[PDB]
Amino acid sequence: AGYTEIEKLEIVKDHLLPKQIKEHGLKKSNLQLRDQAILDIIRYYTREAGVRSLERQLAAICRKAAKAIVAEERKRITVTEKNLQDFIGKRIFRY
């Protein structure tokens, strides 16, 4: 028990690329999110009891988007700060 905002920032920022890319890598490179997003989502939720869960929240939106693989043909799912809402849909803290 000793997680600090910095630690979470180090991993949350690095793992977002390799982690998601791996578990998701299983399917054709289907992941193209931005940093502003990872920071925005967590910033709106910030709800969690450890990084493990946090990473789970990111993976949730990431793959949740992978499922949409049934789209027209747009390859690489872009999860900018806007799409982030379309995927998550709804939030907890309202401004």
From Swiss-Prot:
Domain of life: Bacteria
Assigned protein family: Belongs to the peptidase S16 family.
Subcellular compartments: Cytoplasm
Organism: Bacillus subtilis (strain 168)
Underlying gene: lon1
Residues of the full protein shown: 490 to 584 of 774
Induction record: By heat shock.
Assembly, per entry: Homohexamer. Organized in a ring with a central cavity. Exists as a mixture of small oligomeric species in solution.
Protein name: Lon protease 1
Function description: ATP-dependent serine protease that mediates the selective degradation of mutant and abnormal proteins as well as certain short-lived regulatory proteins. Required for cellular homeostasis and for survival from DNA damage and developmental changes induced by stress. Degrades polypeptides processively to yield small peptide fragments that are 5 to 10 amino acids long. Binds to DNA in a double-stranded, site-specific manner. Has been implicated in preventing sigma(G) activity under non-sporulation conditions.
